[PDB]
Ligand binder design. Structure first.
Ligand SMILES: NC(=O)c1ccc[n+]([C@@H]2O[C@H](COP(=O)([O-])OP(=O)(O)OC[C@H]3O[C@@H](n4cnc5c(N)ncnc54)[C@H](OP(=O)(O)O)[C@@H]3O)[C@@H](O)[C@H]2O)c1
Ligand SMILES: NC(=O)c1ccc[n+]([C@@H]2O[C@H](COP(=O)([O-])OP(=O)(O)OC[C@H]3O[C@@H](n4cnc5c(N)ncnc54)[C@H](OP(=O)(O)O)[C@@H]3O)[C@@H](O)[C@H]2O)c1
Ligand SMILES: NC(=O)c1ccc[n+]([C@@H]2O[C@H](COP(=O)([O-])OP(=O)(O)OC[C@H]3O[C@@H](n4cnc5c(N)ncnc54)[C@H](OP(=O)(O)O)[C@@H]3O)[C@@H](O)[C@H]2O)c1
Ligand SMILES: NC(=O)c1ccc[n+]([C@@H]2O[C@H](COP(=O)([O-])OP(=O)(O)OC[C@H]3O[C@@H](n4cnc5c(N)ncnc54)[C@H](OP(=O)(O)O)[C@@H]3O)[C@@H](O)[C@H]2O)c1
Lengths: 249, 249, 249, 249
């Protein structure tokens, strides 16, 4: 059984490597994400949530991810440098896995997103007229700095800052919310993730998980992909959710 | 086949009779909701969403409800007097039904709520210290005027005014949100409606769908019941939601 | 020179007496607010902002107030038990005074409010239809749990929880904001404090600084009074503002 | 008495020309704003609030402005095509003036802003770390898509969409609010326009009234300038505000 250790800075890589060693696991260190990662039994992320997002941009089929939070808040991580040994041991031996859906939009067919797909204007300080449709029905048209289509996992990211609700990890759904909407009233919409999202806009740009982006004009489609992000089951995922959220910043 | 027609004011009760008559349906009239409605094939509600809420408070087993919106906005209704005869026939003929979960708290053992269970302070202009727990884990503790535990159907009611998100009718869940929270940061939480909610508060009052209340001191649990609200299927429920919401007043 | 010392609990009332001693000031201890306080050169509040709100309720003319916060946050206080001495001496010796307007409403002529005048429904969990006029012009009609009319000082109290903006102490103005407004869109309005505020509501109750209330039906008017609250000049009032607000709860 | 008529389209230029001729006012046509407008007794704007903003960009000394609204909502406007002839005559005959402050940025020494000075990220979908100080005191530090420093006039513009409050036209003040702030809690701040604002951020751009922008790295300061925007007094500005704000989109 071999595993890949991905890291941003040399942080705690030494000890993490030795721990995987004592658990008799072959190790291969990575300076940065690479599609080569698909060829392992599981991955150990060392950094933050951003690290895990970058790792997932290289994966289609996804081996179990165990994340180590090196910073402040880690909604996607399993432990910190302080207790990764105990947890890693439990994860690597119990080998219970857990899945969360990933999305894709027609403008970038090969990209998958865990947090969200954002439609922003190309120039800063410029609005865009965005039309929104889901399962064919026109649900709204609004002028804003951009529009967010996020998963429940994304509810704590960009959507959160736009004023969105925090949604439980285990409740699948889309969160449609505008960024700086110019209208008297507006509300975030929470709909089923089985539905098809269509966003219509001119002189815009699509961004997925803040990584890959492509300029586009007209209309794009967003739906649930077939390749979820996979992690080892975090027994306290729900419990930690509320505490981690109050410390965001 | 027999149907009970419940009305707020006897303004159209005649036309409706001469319509259920044409459809060969035995008809009975009730000026005020009653446990007897439980002995009919279906119920016709004349008035507003409130009318429907008042009817439900009398039903454990719930015959299919066909609502005729008397006024402005009716998220729970099926048509207005301007076209009820048409939509009524399609409903009675196809007889396709739809169900939405109802909840109950321990303070009032036999009452069901379609919108929410709200916990407010007994005296106006006075705060209460509220503690929240779902499935055992402590999720929050905050000072506020009150706290709402709503279903997705209630996401457009009291919860909406407290700044909650608009949630699709076909996505089951709990919107947990405070009313006038006295704290720098706060967010609504959307969790699976399969979980157990617990609200701990002193000098408080519990209200179900705005109909039945009762004072309580301490803990009360809220959870999904076995007796849903049953309505005739509304083929356009999803599309008409966004429109009706923007006109809420 | 004699000064009154008001306290809720026996907290640090001792050392505070001994400090006013070394400053050659005559002391008079009060277990609770009294209209008597008007006959002093200055008052020393020992408790919190609530304590100061309760003291001001019994003062038409207001001798300089010096607050000591034994609580968590005190936007109206000058020091904590840890440094009241140094600050008390500076205040009493330099004796520089600062003033903030107080408001009064027609329903309760003799009452003055430093934070706000709030219009709430008599029964909890019930909305009230509120009409708002400023200087005779109609500004808004809305359904809500209540409606707040606050000063810049109250901007961090009830109005804050209703979603209002924090206004610095030295910018005189009114903050009009509803509690749980039942409407798609709504915004807090910030108008000049020289204007006449008019609130029309049935089955309501008016409250001033959360201390005095009167049931009322019809229309009440609110405007700037002639008896400001008077405190010793607080040099760091402004810079302290932003830190104290983030800790509110 | 000579006046310049600035228009965005051939619209009602003809009828406006006869209207002024019929008033013994010498007129001149301008397709696009010019620094020459400073050489007229008054200016007639045809278009929307944007037209007015673009005209102000070329004026230090500001001759009175009369606005005719082509669009749907014009908070800076005076009349619509349907009745400009009437209002125009009352304006030009009474010649009553009204002034509103414009602020200036240190990154663009000669530009004036009526709505706001906004600091945004250079790249879309990228946050910037923004530090805020007013009158030399540290007020906040937050990660966001941007930050807005608006005047009461701008409170209905960008600040509005960022979730800021509605501040009446006659209450001079600054509105400090972030765009898509990534933090659990946050509040818009309203401070006196006599204070000095300082925004600190790297890899950012400053935009004035959404017209002129420059890249900056470090610290910029914003203060009230000496060159106000001037308009013919709008008798119903205060009452029309609430109506216009509720129709924004
Ligand atoms: N709020 C905003 O203004 C804003 C702007 C752009 C992008 N974003 C979010 O960040 C992602 C793209 O990031 P980026 O490459 O531009 O920069 P980062 O990834 O440089 O910035 C994103 C920040 O958000 C944290 N984060 C990411 N996903 C999160 C989640 N689900 N819940 C809570 N925090 C989360 C990151 O992890 P840390 O613990 O690991 O460091 C980091 O602090 C998007 O998926 C989007 O959700 C937010
Ligand atoms: N926003 C608030 O401040 C507030 C305060 C108390 C109660 N409520 C809500 O009203 C219910 C209690 O009713 P009540 O006897 O006090 O007064 P009503 O029932 O007198 O008032 C409730 C108002 O909300 C509308 N409504 C009801 N259920 C709704 C839903 N699921 N989505 C959108 N609108 C809905 C009703 O419409 P119809 O008659 O008009 O057609 C009615 O206009 C609760 O379930 C709660 O959700 C809201
Ligand atoms: N946010 C809400 O939901 C809510 C509900 C009702 C009343 N209030 C406010 O409470 C006051 C009525 O007093 P009460 O007898 O009901 O309660 P308290 O005064 O029993 O409770 C009020 C709480 O608010 C704090 N507070 C008071 N004035 C403040 C101000 N100007 N800025 C920031 N915090 C302030 C108090 O601080 P200390 O701990 O220092 O006393 C206390 O924690 C009114 O001024 C009203 O604005 C707020
Ligand atoms: N909310 C947002 O996302 C956003 C984004 C960028 C800029 N803005 C605002 O627009 C200005 C820059 O203009 P721009 O070149 O980007 O495009 P515009 O000027 O093309 O767009 C601005 C829109 O806002 C309206 N507007 C302008 N000033 C206003 C004010 N003081 N109060 C209420 N509405 C106002 C305009 O009205 P008319 O159609 O009648 O001219 C127009 O619809 C800035 O001063 C800023 O306040 C807002």
């Amino acid at each position: 059984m071999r595993a890949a250790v991905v890291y941003k800075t040399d942080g705690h890589v030494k000890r993490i490597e030795e721990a995987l060693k004592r658990l008799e696991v072959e190790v291969e260190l990575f300076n940065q994400p690479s599609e080569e990662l698909e060829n392992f039994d599981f991955i150990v992320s060392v950094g933050g949530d951003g690290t895990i997002l970058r790792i997932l941009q290289k994966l289609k089929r996804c081996p179990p991810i165990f994340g180590i939070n090196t910073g402040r808040v880690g909604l996607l991580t399993h432990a910190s440098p302080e207790n990764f040994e105990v947890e890693l041991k439990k994860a690597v031996e119990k080998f219970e896995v857990e899945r969360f859906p990933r999305v894709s939009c027609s403008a970038m067919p090969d990209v998958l997103a865990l947090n969200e797909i954002a439609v922003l204007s190309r120039k800063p300080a410029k609005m865009i007229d965005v039309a929104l449709r889901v399962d064919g029905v026109e649900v709204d048209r609004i002028r804003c700095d951009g529009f967010i289509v996020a998963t429940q996992i994304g509810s704590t990211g960009y959507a959160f800052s736009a004023g969105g609700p925090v949604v439980e990890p285990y409740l699948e759904c889309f969160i449609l919310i505008p960024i700086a909407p110019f209208r008297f009233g507006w509300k975030p919409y929470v709909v089923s993730m089985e539905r098809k999202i269509e966003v219509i806009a001119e002189k815009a740009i699509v961004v997925a998980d803040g990584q890959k982006s492509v300029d586009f004009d007209g209309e794009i489609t967003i739906e649930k992909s077939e390749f979820p992000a996979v992690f080892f089951k975090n027994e306290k995922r729900f419990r930690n959710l509320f505490g981690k959220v109050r410390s965001i910043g």
